[PDB]
Amino acid sequence: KKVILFDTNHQVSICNQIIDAINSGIDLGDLLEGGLLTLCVEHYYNSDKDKFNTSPIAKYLRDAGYEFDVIKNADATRFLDVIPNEPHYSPLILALKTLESTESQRGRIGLFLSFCSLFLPKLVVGDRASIEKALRQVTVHQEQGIVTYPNHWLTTGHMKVIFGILRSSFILKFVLIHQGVNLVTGHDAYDSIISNSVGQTRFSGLLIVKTVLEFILQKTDSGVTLHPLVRTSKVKNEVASFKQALSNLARHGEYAPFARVLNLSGINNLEHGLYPQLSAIALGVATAHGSTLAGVNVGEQYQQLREAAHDAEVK
Amino acid sequence: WDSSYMQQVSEGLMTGKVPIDQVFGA
């Protein structure tokens, strides 16, 4: 899991050219993630290695197994110049050799990251859903005068490129979600878009299981407990499984609302599908308060235990 | 079930704020 950062004295040049290349649909191959990290070390740290090595961003990516490698080259203005000299970067070298690159203003890194952040809220549902959402949200930020993206970023062709970059990059998505959740005033104006989108990504693909959980929990004199019917012998397997799945999620700590968007490990058994008895009981309990667990279909053989949970939540 | 402060609990179980086996047993 080696990630190459690029280190030059004209970082802003180098960076905006990586953005040009991403916007042009050029495939950076294995240099993608270290391209995108290299960006990020600017919107947040001026290419200062020392300030980056102390951030909670760097600690998490190391705790996740990443190790950063560095291309020191001081005297070079083009992204072209920082690509290592290997046959396997030839077709990338070729594409970069011919690419468009206008003079680049500094809002642009930030502007780019803000735009990527708009795909998060529905990323896990697929391209169509991530793109229609992001397009509705461009309308809100444009209308607020917060930003106007270039009009050509708003085509489905361009948007598909960006969505695929997001699916492809763990690091990109994580920088966004972290800086998202730790914003107060932000690094700059582009940061509050990121936070707002990231706020709307919270429990994406974890909302139904989250709800089922909520409704199998009861208040008591002696603290918060599981509901009595959950602690019976017919539910013992499901409870043990659910708990192990739930314990896997809680390893992700503050990033656990974003586990599925980040594809974090150990959440494969958090489908509410797998716990039909627990789904029934949450339903029973929800209906008495009186929610409708939307997406929780209660199969017909578990209907009695739903009733049991409902009748006894009123009692 | 009440208070809709359950959401605070349930989310805490999910982000490791509320110890799990306190609710679910060892």
Swiss-Prot record, chain A:
Encapsidates the genome, protecting it from nucleases. The encapsidated genomic RNA is termed the nucleocapsid and serves as template for transcription and replication. During replication, encapsidation by NP is coupled to RNA synthesis and all replicative products are resistant to nucleases. This is Nucleoprotein. Homooligomer. Homomultimerizes to form the nucleocapsid. Binds to viral genomic RNA. Interacts with VP35 and VP30 to form the nucleocapsid. Also interacts with VP24 and VP40. The chain holds residues 21 to 335 of 695 of the full protein. It is found in: Virion; Host cytoplasm. Belongs to the filoviruses nucleoprotein family. Residues 296-315 form a coiled coil. This protein can be divided into a hydrophobic N-terminal half, and a hydrophilic and highly acidic C-terminal half. It comes from the Viruses. Phosphorylated.
Swiss-Prot record, chain B:
Disulfide bonds: none annotated. It is found in: Virion; Host cytoplasm. Plays an essential role in viral RNA synthesis and also a role in suppressing innate immune signaling. Homooligomer. Homomultimerization via the coiled coil domain is a prerequisite for binding to L. Found in a trimeric complex in which VP35 bridges L and the nucleoprotein. Interacts with NP. Disrupts innate immune signaling in infected host cell. Belongs to the filoviridae polymerase cofactor VP35 family. This is Polymerase cofactor VP35. It comes from Lake Victoria marburgvirus (strain Ozolin-75) (MARV). The chain holds residues 2 to 27 of 329 of the full protein.
